[PDB]
Motif scaffolding. Structure first.
Motif, mmCIF file in Angstrom:
data_model
loop_
_atom_site.group_PDB
_atom_site.id
_atom_site.type_symbol
_atom_site.label_atom_id
_atom_site.label_comp_id
_atom_site.label_asym_id
_atom_site.label_seq_id
_atom_site.Cartn_x
_atom_site.Cartn_y
_atom_site.Cartn_z
ATOM 1 N N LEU A 193 17.053 -7.114 44.062
ATOM 2 C CA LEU A 193 16.554 -6.910 45.427
ATOM 3 C C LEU A 193 15.610 -8.030 45.846
ATOM 4 C CD1 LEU A 193 16.328 -5.305 48.028
ATOM 5 C CD2 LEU A 193 14.708 -3.766 46.895
ATOM 6 N N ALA A 194 14.730 -8.437 44.937
ATOM 7 C CA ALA A 194 13.836 -9.565 45.196
ATOM 8 C C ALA A 194 14.637 -10.841 45.436
ATOM 9 C CB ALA A 194 12.858 -9.755 44.051
ATOM 10 N N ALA A 195 15.679 -11.056 44.630
ATOM 11 C CA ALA A 195 16.552 -12.240 44.763
ATOM 12 C C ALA A 195 17.316 -12.263 46.088
ATOM 13 C CB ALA A 195 17.529 -12.325 43.598
ATOM 14 N N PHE A 196 17.799 -11.098 46.519
ATOM 15 C CA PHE A 196 18.458 -10.945 47.818
ATOM 16 C C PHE A 196 17.532 -11.362 48.961
ATOM 17 C CE2 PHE A 196 19.090 -8.115 51.550
ATOM 18 C CZ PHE A 196 20.355 -8.531 51.950
ATOM 19 N N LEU A 197 16.296 -10.876 48.917
ATOM 20 C CA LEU A 197 15.290 -11.228 49.915
ATOM 21 C C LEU A 197 14.840 -12.701 49.812
ATOM 22 C CD1 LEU A 197 13.444 -7.883 49.566
ATOM 23 C CD2 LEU A 197 14.344 -8.713 51.750
#
Ligand SMILES: [Mg+2]
Ligand SMILES: [Mg+2]
Ligand SMILES: [Mg+2]
Ligand SMILES: [Mg+2]
Lengths: 184, 185
Positions: free
Chosen positions: A22-26
């Motif tokens: 999720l952090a990587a997506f953002l």
């Protein structure tokens, strides 16, 4: 602006993996983001000694709450004040699920203590990674915690998003992204 | 049934000494005694945690409370259940004075946290050793803490016995003894 998300579920349900993704997506969208966790995010030493001791459920909850109180003041609120997406891996719902439903502490009281400890901060979305304890204090205990989480999610359908944690990690991530897209 | 007693006040006001002497007085006349203290009586490791740099008053109180909850359940109630006189050097009122009046936390919240932590256990008597704040985080903090203690004692005048901590320690111990003699024929 600021946006506060949380992840919840039993240990073994892919929360760390899904937080990372999720952090990587953002990060791929250029949105600044902060990854954090409980227990240990406020007072690291609380994590160490809950590891190697067994206290009464009341004491356990109050230690978790002390950590939670420093975590909110020193890590989460300052992150949100800078306009970051703060992702916390476990927040208040863990204490409600494990110490409340699991160990039997009264939830009205648990929420009483949390009011000043969290300064009233609650996540905009919470992702619950649901699964039976076999798919991740005895099996009966973990069953109570799991049903506790489901009970909490039934109570707040606007905050909780319940995902089947047994699914492939790629599908779960895309599902989280789908639910999150409208809020960015 | 047991008897639960506490000693309270600012650090330097002779509370440890009085707790020690109080224990002896009771032992002498064949009353079994359990001497204990906070912070550390429930969870020894909390004492380290409390000294954390720039700890929020909320978290400080929750640490004291966690220790207090373990202390009441594992040490204080089992002692009282055994008919002992349990003497605690600091209890809930320390948090009310320091974290409430001193650090500015709202008292009702503190009490509501405490209700489940302490299982509603209150001392029969609390011996407040009132010391001047300059003889104890500057002076203005300790001024609030001192006056908070005195406020708590005003509100529960039957429970608190307020004593001048600058008196000679034998005169303080004698005054503690005289307040207890009605509670143990
Ligand atoms: Mg809490
Ligand atoms: Mg679940
Ligand atoms: Mg307390
Ligand atoms: Mg007291």
């Amino acid at each position: 602006p600021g946006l506060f998300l949380t992840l919840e579920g039993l240990d073994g349900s892919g929360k760390t993996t899904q937080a990372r993704r999720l952090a990587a997506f953002l990060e791929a969208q250029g949105r600044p983001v902060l990854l954090t966790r409980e227990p240990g995010g406020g007072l690291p030493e609380v994590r160490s000694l809950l590891l190697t001791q067994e206290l009464s459920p009341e004491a356990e909850y109050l230690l978790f709450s002390a950590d939670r109180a420093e975590h909110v003041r020193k890590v989460i609120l300052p992150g949100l004040a800078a306009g970051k997406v703060v992702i916390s891996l476990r927040y208040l719902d863990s204490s409600l699920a494990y110490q409340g439903y699991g160990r039997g502490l009264p939830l009205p009281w648990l929420r009483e203590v949390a009011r000043e400890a969290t300064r009233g901060l609650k996540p905009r979305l919470t992702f619950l990674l649901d699964l039976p304890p076999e798919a991740a204090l005895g099996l009966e205990f973990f069953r109570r915690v799991r049903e506790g989480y489901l009970a909490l999610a039934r109570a707040e359908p606007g905050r909780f998003v319940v995902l089947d944690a047994t699914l492939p990690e790629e599908e779960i991530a895309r599902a989280i992204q789908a639910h999150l897209r409208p809020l960015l």
